[PDB]
Amino acid sequence: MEFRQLKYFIAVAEAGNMAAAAKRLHVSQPPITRQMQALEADLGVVLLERSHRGIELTAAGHAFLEDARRILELAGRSGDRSRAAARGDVGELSVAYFGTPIYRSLPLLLRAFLTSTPTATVSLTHMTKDEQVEGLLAGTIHVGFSRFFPRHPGIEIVNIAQEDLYLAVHRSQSGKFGKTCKLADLRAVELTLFPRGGRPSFADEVIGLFKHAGIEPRIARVVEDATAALALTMAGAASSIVPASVAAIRWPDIAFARIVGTRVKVPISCIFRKEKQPPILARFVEHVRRSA
Amino acid sequence: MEFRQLKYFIAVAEAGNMAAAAKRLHVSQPPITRQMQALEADLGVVLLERSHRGIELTAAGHAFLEDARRILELAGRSGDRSRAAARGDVGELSVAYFGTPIYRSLPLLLRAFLTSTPTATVSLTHMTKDEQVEGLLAGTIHVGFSRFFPRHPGIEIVNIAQEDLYLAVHRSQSGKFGKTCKLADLRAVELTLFPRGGRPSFADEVIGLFKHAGIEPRIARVVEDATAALALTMAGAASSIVPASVAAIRWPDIAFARIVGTRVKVPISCIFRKEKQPPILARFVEHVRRSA
Amino acid sequence: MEFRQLKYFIAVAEAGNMAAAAKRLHVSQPPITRQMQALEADLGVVLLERSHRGIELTAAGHAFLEDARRILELAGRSGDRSRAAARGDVGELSVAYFGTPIYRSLPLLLRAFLTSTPTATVSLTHMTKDEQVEGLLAGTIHVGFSRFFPRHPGIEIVNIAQEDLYLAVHRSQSGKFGKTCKLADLRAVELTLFPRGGRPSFADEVIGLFKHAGIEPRIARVVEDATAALALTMAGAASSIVPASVAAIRWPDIAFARIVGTRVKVPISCIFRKEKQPPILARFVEHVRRSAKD
Amino acid sequence: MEFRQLKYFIAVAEAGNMAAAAKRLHVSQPPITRQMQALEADLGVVLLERSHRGIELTAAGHAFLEDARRILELAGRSGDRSRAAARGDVGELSVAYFGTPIYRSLPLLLRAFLTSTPTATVSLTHMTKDEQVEGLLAGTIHVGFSRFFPRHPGIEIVNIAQEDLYLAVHRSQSGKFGKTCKLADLRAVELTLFPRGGRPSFADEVIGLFKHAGIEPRIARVVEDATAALALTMAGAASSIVPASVAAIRWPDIAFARIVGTRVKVPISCIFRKEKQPPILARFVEHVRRSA
Numbered sequence A, B, D: 001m002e003f004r005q006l007k008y009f010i011a012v013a014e015a016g017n018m019a020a021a022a023k024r025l026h027v028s029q030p031p032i033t034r035q036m037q038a039l040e041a042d043l044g045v046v047l048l049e050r051s052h053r054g055i056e057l058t059a060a061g062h063a064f065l066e067d068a069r070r071i072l073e074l075a076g077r078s079g080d081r082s083r084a085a086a087r088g089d090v091g092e093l094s095v096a097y098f099g100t101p102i103y104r105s106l107p108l109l110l111r112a113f114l115t116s117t118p119t120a121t122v123s124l125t126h127m128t129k130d131e132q133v134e135g136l137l138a139g140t141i142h143v144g145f146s147r148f149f150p151r152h153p154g155i156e157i158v159n160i161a162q163e164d165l166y167l168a169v170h171r172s173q174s175g176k177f178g179k180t181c182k183l184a185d186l187r188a189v190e191l192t193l194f195p196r197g198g199r200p201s202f203a204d205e206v207i208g209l210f211k212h213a214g215i216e217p218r219i220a221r222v223v224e225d226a227t228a229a230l231a232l233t234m235a236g237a238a239s240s241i242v243p244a245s246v247a248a249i250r251w252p253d254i255a256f257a258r259i260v261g262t263r264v265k266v267p268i269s270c271i272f273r274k275e276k277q278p279p280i281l282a283r284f285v286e287h288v289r290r291s292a
Numbered sequence C: 001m002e003f004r005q006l007k008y009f010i011a012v013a014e015a016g017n018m019a020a021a022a023k024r025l026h027v028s029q030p031p032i033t034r035q036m037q038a039l040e041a042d043l044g045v046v047l048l049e050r051s052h053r054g055i056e057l058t059a060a061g062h063a064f065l066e067d068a069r070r071i072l073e074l075a076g077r078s079g080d081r082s083r084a085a086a087r088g089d090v091g092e093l094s095v096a097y098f099g100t101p102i103y104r105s106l107p108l109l110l111r112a113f114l115t116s117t118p119t120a121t122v123s124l125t126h127m128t129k130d131e132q133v134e135g136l137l138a139g140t141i142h143v144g145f146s147r148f149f150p151r152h153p154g155i156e157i158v159n160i161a162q163e164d165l166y167l168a169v170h171r172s173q174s175g176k177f178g179k180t181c182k183l184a185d186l187r188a189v190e191l192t193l194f195p196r197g198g199r200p201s202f203a204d205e206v207i208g209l210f211k212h213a214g215i216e217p218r219i220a221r222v223v224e225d226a227t228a229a230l231a232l233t234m235a236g237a238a239s240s241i242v243p244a245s246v247a248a249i250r251w252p253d254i255a256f257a258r259i260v261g262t263r264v265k266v267p268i269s270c271i272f273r274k275e276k277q278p279p280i281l282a283r284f285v286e287h288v289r290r291s292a293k294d
Helices: A003-015 A018-025 A029-043 A059-087 A105-115 A129-138 A171-177 A202-212 A226-234 A279-289 B003-015 B018-025 B030-043 B059-085 B105-116 B129-137 B171-177 B202-212 B226-234 B279-291 C003-015 C018-025 C029-043 C059-087 C105-116 C129-138 C171-176 C202-213 C226-234 C244-248 C279-291 D003-015 D018-025 D030-043 D059-087 D105-116 D129-138 D171-176 D202-213 D226-234 D279-291
Strands: A092-097 A121-126 A143-146 A155-170 A191-193 A219-222 A240-243 A254-259 A265-273 B048-051 B054-057 B091-097 B120-126 B143-146 B155-170 B191-193 B219-222 B239-243 B254-259 B265-273 C048-050 C055-057 C091-097 C120-126 C143-146 C155-170 C190-193 C218-222 C239-243 C254-259 C265-273 D091-097 D120-126 D144-146 D155-163 D165-170 D190-193 D218-222 D239-243 D254-259 D266-273
Touching: A003 A018, A003 A029, A003 A059, A018 A029, A029 D059, A059 A092, A059 A129, A059 D030, A059 D059, A059 D279, A092 A129, A092 A279, A105 A155, A105 A265, A105 A279, A105 C226, A121 C226, A129 A143, A129 A265, A143 A279, A155 A171, A155 A226, A155 A279, A171 A254, A191 A202, A191 A226, A191 A240, A202 B202, A226 A240, A226 A254, A226 C105, A226 C120, A265 A279, B003 B018, B003 B030, B003 B048, B003 B054, B003 B059, B018 B030, B018 B054, B030 C059, B054 B059, B059 B091, B059 C029, B059 C059, B059 C279, B091 B105, B091 B129, B091 B279, B105 B120, B105 B155, B105 B265, B105 B279, B105 D226, B120 D226, B129 B143, B129 B265, B155 B171, B155 B226, B155 B279, B171 B254, B191 B202, B191 B226, B226 B239, B226 B254, B226 D105, B226 D120, B265 B279, C003 C018, C003 C029, C003 C055, C003 C059, C018 C029, C055 C059, C059 C279, C091 C105, C091 C129, C091 C279, C105 C120, C105 C155, C105 C279, C129 C143, C129 C155, C129 C265, C155 C171, C155 C226, C155 C244, C155 C279, C171 C254, C190 C202, C190 C226, C226 C239, C226 C254, C239 C244, C265 C279, D003 D018, D003 D030, D003 D059, D018 D030, D059 D279, D091 D105, D091 D129, D091 D279, D105 D120, D105 D155, D105 D279, D129 D144, D129 D155, D129 D266, D155 D279, D165 D171, D165 D226, D171 D254, D190 D202, D190 D226, D226 D239, D226 D254, D266 D279
Parallel strands: A092 A121, A092 A143, A191 A219, B091 B120, B091 B143, B191 B219, B191 B239, C091 C120, C091 C143, C190 C218, C190 C239, D091 D120, D091 D144, D190 D218, D190 D239
Antiparallel strands: A143 A265, A155 A240, A155 A254, A155 A265, B048 B054, B143 B265, B155 B239, B155 B254, B155 B265, C048 C055, C143 C265, C155 C239, C155 C254, C155 C265, D144 D266, D155 D266, D165 D239, D165 D254
């Protein structure tokens, strides 16, 4: 294996074509090809099928393409890390997120950590709970944020805190509900929940909380994320239910009523690989532990 | 509008090109064109357009296609329905279904109906919950079955009975759980649920019941229906959770364990138009009313 | 069985008798009589009997009457739906977006559309500008929203409106700039831009506006989208520059100063495939065009 | 950045001095030192300084050290993953089905596949035979299942089972036919056929069996699939002819009479593209062929 190969393989994949890839590398075709037979031989696997109506990846190719990406990322973040220790910096904490903690709870938490680790910087990437695990194992991300995490043997889950839930209506409905409400008050309200298929997801928790209180909720639809539901709510085409992180923000034409109920609550959680924690992660975990 | 026009339209829409539509109606090309010109001039819309790319329906065509199928279906019954009111007979109950009531709870109920109402016959069609309401309003179906129905203005919902739920594992795994279990025993089990979408659905109730018992269920995947889940469990590839109707049938290679709990239940429900009830329906409603 | 038989049967039942049925239908009697003979023969049942007070319904007659009403009610409704769809009163406009129009400008646009077409729905999908172009050609989506788009043959771009830019800082630094600032006040501020990737992007334009202004910006980083920029700014870790959509929302711990300058704006735009526009898209385009005059 | 640099740098820093590295690697000293000077140049800082004991690591030194091990580990797991996929130890088998193979052959086959390739997964979709053809040639599915299946250029149809036919009747009619019957015994029986759809289908098979015996069948109905046919049978509202796969399973309130009078075996066909089989399909094909 070698670093030129991984750039060149990624080149040939994304372009779907040998001539198109000569262009974006600014080199010629034959040395790309000889570098591809170099990779293929080092790995012991055919990555590419040099065919007619383009040029296709084999199954090994697709699998590796994902990994070759992650390898160039690790090295890129590792060059930053050495420059960072040289200057006396603590270096970059690579953080990933899914869902609505990003709106408030999680920034508040990064604030607190950054305040007592003042050379530390931060990266934020939206990733699914699955991409988050792949990244933690590869080393490309140190910690991951969401609400509900399935267990994975090499990963620890910490539940930091609970956040209340809020009804979200267009501003023209503000009067109907007030500042507080009960799940019982919402049985006739048509809900747009989110996300689709993260299962079990935030929508399942919402739906579950209604069922716990003996109500089948009116579900109009399930949209990809809070962004979509908030936008539809803003446009007068939807109501929704969001965590407190979203309701702590003041969106024009959206109004919020806190749902009262000791049970009506969702977690911020994070996950991290427990095997080989770099110092910055270890420091960060000690921080979020005494936050829990 | 004429029935021949509807019929030729459907054929042109499914077949996608004039040559294929002519072969399928055992008629030449120009009579089809005439019938479609006639149809568009009566409705006052262009339903379809012909190019070198063949037939392409317009949006109005897609809208009409769906209704034109229903119009013919309803017409086709009027024969034997009039030919039954003449005989003194009660005639045919047209029933839809979605989900697992079809495996046993529904068949038993239909049996009880047929057995006390002997000049009655029944027909049965799979239909999504939305398609069921569509069909109620169109008079194509007298009554639908599933478990959880969203409310719709001139529709009634009767909750008839409740069904237990059962864990479904491969027979090799039988010793793990025995013949009964509780949801708390299943916290480690990778579950396959169904359906996708149609929220809240059977999968939502299952996830909800876990959450009511204090557990985040471990969900490996959500498949399209009971059939895929059962076959995946038969293959050793899954564990699932199903209503009693499914577990009453001795599928090979599946071990079922009844899940015990007061809340661990799912309804059999039906829906019908609550306004223009024909005698067959009114008789069936009386019959169900009582079973409930 | 035929539609004329169904109209004719209903008229017979209402009219009471044949002479009445004929005037009701602006038709002579023999055509009606012959149609009803044909009906009775196609079904193989007796539906009416010619006697004293005109025409009277058998059991099967009454049963066929109800079904005859049902077939015509549905035919009539199906004509109505078919035609609403042609006019664009019904249907789901499939919409995609990239970047910050989603925060304000796009929601308002949709609110007007959905208000003017109350039987329409909308679905929303995050999408890179390239995914948008592929979805348009394929018919997977009807319209896409961003700021700057690459050109494509069968795709029209509409520049709808312009949005002011705002400096975004942590609440702690609010005092340093006040309610407004100029590009040249910002030469020492470490900026976090966005997005990297979908280029020409907002980031490039911000940089462009500094170049034109004769200022070299201190760019600490280009992060992946506005959500990263704003989160980091909320965490005290960054400053950024954002469109008015973002500035209109009130985030805890974030403060904004409007960047003054008539040229300091960014467009909101949308693309759609121009040729085979389904009627619900045609309707949305009328609303897009009149919004771009305003 | 290069893999030579990383592999040496770790050695330099495990054995202490520039010379003892040339021992463990079997290299020499001047090549190593050119690498550590091209590395330090590329990174932009110094990882080692030449004191009297040997060389020691800067703060940037121990930083890149951990990040270099982690790059080689990730690089090695990536190679593993990529050969695992190439051999087919790993990957998802996307299966489609139409009709009654879902009741026995399909999940028996998946069982043998998953048992002997334990880290493989499977998906499962119902799919008409036309959709199946399009899926296989598009790569979206790997393998299909049906009774009969039209011959197509790039498609292999393998015959995997040959099944008997049984009459199915409500439990109450069991004594009327016994445990075996002949077609001639069925001439007064109102039969429900299935499916309508992918024709020629099991429905044509049954129609054909009567045509060949010169017996006119009473066809009361043709319903969507076996599920509908069995439900009507269970409800006392029908009789049907079914494959063995269905008759083998105990169904509450359904009795089965084997149709004898011989020469009657209904095929089950497995299908897949002949060319460019992914490793995960090539593997499944092993079991398919063993089943033929």
